[PDB]
Design a protein around this ligand. Structure first.
Ligand SMILES: Nc1ncnc2c1ncn2[C@@H]1O[C@H](CF)[C@@H](O)[C@H]1O
Ligand SMILES: Nc1ncnc2c1ncn2[C@@H]1O[C@H](CF)[C@@H](O)[C@H]1O
Ligand SMILES: Nc1ncnc2c1ncn2[C@@H]1O[C@H](CF)[C@@H](O)[C@H]1O
Ligand SMILES: Nc1ncnc2c1ncn2[C@@H]1O[C@H](CF)[C@@H](O)[C@H]1O
Ligand SMILES: Nc1ncnc2c1ncn2[C@@H]1O[C@H](CF)[C@@H](O)[C@H]1O
Ligand SMILES: Nc1ncnc2c1ncn2[C@@H]1O[C@H](CF)[C@@H](O)[C@H]1O
Ligand code: MET
Ligand code: MET
Ligand code: MET
Ligand code: MET
Ligand code: MET
Ligand code: MET
Lengths: 291, 291, 291, 291, 291, 291
């Protein structure tokens, strides 16, 4: 029962994703295409990375992640197809996903195929990989790929072959690690006792604010649940609350919750109210937290 | 061929829905996950209710409706899983859905799993239920649920177990009726001969205006198709049109149509033009109807 | 493994599409419903046409395209169901879609079912058709169709019967060609040496500008890749670039690329930057091009 | 104590009006410059006309109205300077302005100087004129006028000479009536008993809606204060109220007032609430009124 | 050399203010009309109050303040004309305005004429009054006032008579104190050691945030310059800065300054950046201060 | 008859300017205060400079320009008061302003008083100065100036003393040239034959685009009226038109006019249509021009 989980910047306002899906069903008749999302900021490889990094543990083993923003479409660039190593635990706590104790996933159980443009940076960081290949075989990509639609040609199409059981090592030549493009992930710096990062994302549609300050950055600073925090956003907007597991811990609706999100990072929200929207808080604003 | 029809407030801009779906396929490999919608106003249980109440008759019997906005995520709250009684006719007329005379649906043929937060108020109102259980079993929910992600932990996960044939009564303790949280559904009042309600929704993306004045409410006044109505929105807009079956009955494009929507409610629109958008009409504005 | 590819104006903000899908799975238990998109401008038949015309070559043979904007919902109008002739090559170059040399699609391999309101004009233009029928049989549509929901009653539902193998010729009487409503496709005019058309679409979410000036119109002017072009939008913006295969050919990020999009049309973008959005360029603006 | 009352489209965001004023004080040291307004929609001669037509009765005799939108600036066009005849009563009732019984103004007591572009159409209609001259004398305009600033050169400057006592007949040659450009003022038509006009203006900053239906159009239709009116706006938005002298007559705050504005025209408003803004009502929308 | 300082809600987008001014010059030929502002929120008497309360010390003795938002226009209501008592010091410090030690203003040296709608509440509070009269005499108001234009009829006109030396006591009957309408000025409450008020205004066009926590309120807590304050806006923004005299005291551009504004009120801003606009801070949001 | 022409960033939404005016009339009873404008972008000294540099030739000799954006308000900074040298011709052509051959202005005839923050940079550049003084004397500024209102304390107030005939040299110590803060005026660069500058301003309310490319820069390139120009905005919009004196020279309404504005600068507009607004063109965008 092959799955392709499909994350793109293609949007859902035209038939672009459907073209890809048509081809996925063409190539892998029995496939299930799962949309991850298609609304990532176009060409923002770091943002795209966020939508795909945590996926493996939730998916059945053998799932192929077709993940693409492809601003280098139509160039001599070729996608990378990698088998990841650890499906990797996640969340505020770091666990296997699912009922009971969760579902453990065997190593080497997921393939990502993406533009070799750094999209997979954090996937590779968090999961490691067992093998990586340049996607060049005309068995898995068009001989004449549409210049402006490498998302389809060099990701959707070959992901469907991979889902169909096309041997990964046959999509093209092995890539050495240095040949896998990566983006530099900005460090959470320590400025005194304070951890200084950025708003990594606004958690739509809630307006929760996610920072790139991980629980590990917090552990590394001696802050666990219950710790009274000052979280300053945008070097202007100050917030103060204990670190709590969840939103309702803030008490009243609208109260500030500082918490660890489901991806494991320091975040801030109002309890059942949007924090980000009324204040127009945005991804990329500084996030400083201090006890 | 089990189906989970999934309605959440999770949006489609990140991988949150995909995480739930990954887990649904993990748990119930042969499941078809049908998106209901994921764009509901977060935490607005009355709005969420509107997207799920009409669903059963459309779906094959045995469908599980995983329906969730979960502001109380991470609290001691637990979801409720209910087997509804009547699949219930619907529409302007009140009929089975489908070709011919429609597909009659057996009773007790659908399960809803939702936060016990009132989301299912109108589902229970319109369909009744045969049994309801608190969702507590570690067989169907994580032993260590992600605090901020009960949509996944307490709805998506257990829904897939239910879709996989996990016995409903084994999800947890039977809930007594009074233990099923309900929201108060504001009544359509009679102010003289006029029926007084609200705009229940703007019917996106058309900008049609839906009221909570149901066909049955109109029948209480003997208002049927052909009746020349004054529909006053926001207190000051005495729209006038006969009640007609459809938009084109208004005649010229842009003409006011007063009609019964597909959910059976008194609605107002322009014929092949947006009524609500140009004039910024909104849910919650008063609506009054009379002949 | 039947597929219904479903393109509507229903949006994805409520359960409307899900109701259609529920019925599609009810009627055709084995079906895979692939969303094309549901965000088309309501009632804009010409725009809806763009999202469906290029679909066939992407999909497995036997796919049914349920394509609908239905402003005449509730009227005596009835859908048209057509078996197209040529799946037809497409793209900047004009080729079969897929890996290798692409997937050749047999003739007569796809059915569209749509309102008979011109939605299928370009489908018919580009693919031809072998047979067209009015969709009237209560075997494939409701006896009492919901007045305001013909998208479901007269498209979704019968599309699922067609997917389920209901004989096309049994949906109703054959339509003669003149009975299939067409919209007039505005011609690309020659104004001297310049080809004059319109911005056909803003390519969301990138803000690329698509014109209705086809590759064929360009190679009729001796315009091929490498030609230095002046492309004037909205009658005042005389962008200049060579015609290149792709965005990155513009060089620096933000530079103007004039290219043939994946649908084969003269288009203009910035390289990995939005062209349309900063300047609020829009569909329907004039588009002039000269070598 | 000479007054120039100055109405332009120059805005108040830069020093444009100040340049004009500087010159007015240069030429007429003892002048008082009164700003009428400078925010009229640029080049909208009909809208500009509204801001100047009612002015004379409020001003001391001898006031010069410098009134300008000048889209033909820098052309061979020359301003017209006219001495009006009747200062003319105004208002909902038609009276002299001021305390007691008002201040009667002698005939021939005001000069307008404006581009000869129709700006003065309604001034001439409502007031008549005694003499009109083309403004060409280098005694009153620059020998080398700034091409893009005829508002200054051909209106502000010569208005200051006129205020200073420069003989009007000496600014240039007499204009025959046909040489005074006029705009066609759209008629309030009778469609049955209903009077059909347009929203002439949104009365900022209140959001009151003014129509071009005059009390005389209403008198001519048998509607005076107390008459129950239906006023339909934009051929969509319907309103109903008696014709009342004022806003507070509507009763509750927010209630619909249909009234005659201070310029004498049928208008509609909410009582101490904005009508136009929440509904995005605009100038140019149809205004149909019926009893 | 009489001055009328004119504050209305009339806006500057049409000729309404000019009509009033024309009449002011008609009645008092030698008057200087000073615009205070005309952009106040219509009908918001508390906001209007803020624009007029601080005016007297700035103006030459004998200045008439014509101050008006007149929602009760056209009713039996009549304006009030008051001679204030103390011109009153002001500012962060509480001082006479002007160079050197400032211009001391005699008592009883200013008249306000306003609707008797509470607009003068804070004027009377902060300045006291010596006499107050209802404005009823046809010597100073129209015998037939334009119903919808009492700003002109009952304020502008009589103000000019007052400016011309019309005896104040002759405008009409003396009003007893209780006959002068007042609005309730919400108190700055003490919630522990914190002072709890509201954002009284956004200081346009800078986006500074003004509170109704006056210097005198801070003095009640012994809060002076240098005190490290927590200023919480909207309930969740614990701004922290010392109370400083000015913006630049915050140091770097964009740093938070907590200060006493020129009206003497606790305020918060960024240094040479907008505080309110980026975060959409608004009048009426809660404000709390403590050391 | 002294004049103070007052340009500030104070806006016109509150009584701030009126307070300044009150004091100006207090200090200089005979003065006429002419508003230049009060809407300049706060703290933008370069933009403020544009509104004041061209003023002198328009005003009667002896005019005082009180020009202020004062982000250093409340600091030890003190205003500069300068007597300029040349009133200087201006416009597209470079001429005295006024009727006939214009009004020649004697040298040393105008005083500017401003924060010493570079606001006067272009004033000094274009007019030169004869004398400059630091404004420190308590005869012309408050002994205890309001910390946050130096616009009033250090500009308005002393400007009125200067208007009143207070000797300029007595306001404080002479400033040496190096003590008068200047901003760096970005140069118009030559990039080949093309002149490269910036959009200096959007000319509101018309949406004309002004560049910092001066007539002098054009006639140094042999560019005069009639020259066919390519003017590229924002690095992507290569508008083409001949250089013409005025907007109407573009022909049809909406056509592109490239012209020299009234300040003498290369500008681009549409003929009686907004260029800047539809395309959201902005100050600071690159502006390139070539013959
Ligand atoms: N203007 C664009 N520049 C660079 N890449 C673009 C642009 N528009 C779309 N794309 C990319 O094309 C990929 C299809 F293969 C899409 O997913 C975009 O990332
Ligand atoms: N800020 C929030 N406050 C309360 N609940 C929230 C917030 N943000 C998201 N949620 C809920 O978390 C659920 C996942 F379990 C989402 O569906 C939200 O309803
Ligand atoms: N206001 C409307 N006028 C005409 N058609 C409409 C309107 N709103 C929705 N529709 C059509 O109803 C169809 C379902 F049958 C939707 O797909 C809309 O096209
Ligand atoms: N783009 C423009 N086209 C035509 N007229 C314009 C344009 N911009 C400004 N103006 C007119 O110039 C007059 C100055 F004399 C202004 O008052 C505008 O009406
Ligand atoms: N819609 C309105 N309701 C009540 N008062 C209003 C309305 N529009 C304007 N006004 C008042 O009329 C006054 C002139 F006398 C204006 O200053 C408004 O306050
Ligand atoms: N937030 C502010 N930072 C620095 N200066 C400011 C701020 N708000 C207002 N100002 C200046 O105060 C001056 C009056 F003296 C105003 O003109 C602003 O320039
Ligand atoms: C915190 S609510 C759960 C969904 C959310 N978008 C997340 O990924 O964590
Ligand atoms: C308005 S046509 C059908 C779709 C609509 N949202 C409905 O539920 O009735
Ligand atoms: C612009 S890159 C590919 C997606 C685009 N919407 C297309 O149809 O070609
Ligand atoms: C109706 S309130 C008075 C001012 C308004 N703008 C008018 O001209 O009538
Ligand atoms: C903010 S600087 C001075 C102007 C301000 N609006 C005030 O009244 O204090
Ligand atoms: C654009 S026409 C005249 C007004 C313009 N703001 C200028 O300074 O030239």
């Amino acid at each position: 029962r092959p799955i392709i989980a499909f994350m793109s910047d293609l949007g859902t306002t035209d038939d672009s994703v459907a073209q890809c899906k048509g081809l996925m069903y063409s190539i892998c008749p029995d496939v299930t295409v799962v949309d991850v999302c298609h609304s990532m900021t176009p060409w923002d490889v770091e943002e795209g990375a966020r939508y795909i990094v945590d996926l493996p543990r939730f998916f059945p083993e053998g799932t192929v992640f077709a993940t693409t923003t492809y601003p280098a479409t139509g160039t001599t660039t070729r996608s990378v197809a990698v088998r990841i190593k650890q499906a990797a635990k996640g969340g505020a706590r770091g666990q296997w996903a699912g009922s009971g104790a969760g579902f453990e996933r065997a190593e080497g159980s997921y393939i990502y195929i993406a533009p070799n443009n750094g999209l997979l940076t954090t996937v590779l960081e968090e999961h490691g990989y067992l093998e990586a290949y340049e996607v060049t075989s005309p068995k898995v990509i068009p001989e004449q790929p549409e210049p402006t639609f490498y998302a389809r040609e060099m990701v959707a199409i070959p992901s469907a072959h991979l889902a169909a059981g096309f041997p990964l090592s046959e999509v093209g030549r092995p890539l050495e690690d240095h040949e896998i493009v990566r983006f530099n992930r900005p460090a959470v710096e320590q400025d005194g006792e304070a951890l200084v990062g950025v708003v990594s994302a606004i958690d739509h549609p809630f307006g929760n604010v996610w920072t790139n300050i991980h629980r590990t950055d917090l552990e590394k600073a001696g802050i666990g649940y219950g710790a009274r925090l000052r979280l300053t956003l945008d070097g202007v907007l100050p917030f103060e609350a204990p670190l709590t597991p969840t939103f309702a811990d803030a008490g009243e609706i609208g109260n500030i919750a500082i918490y660890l999100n489901s991806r494991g990072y320091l975040s801030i929200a109002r309890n059942a109210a949007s924090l980000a929207y009324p204040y127009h808080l945005k991804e990329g604003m500084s996030a400083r937290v201090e006890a």
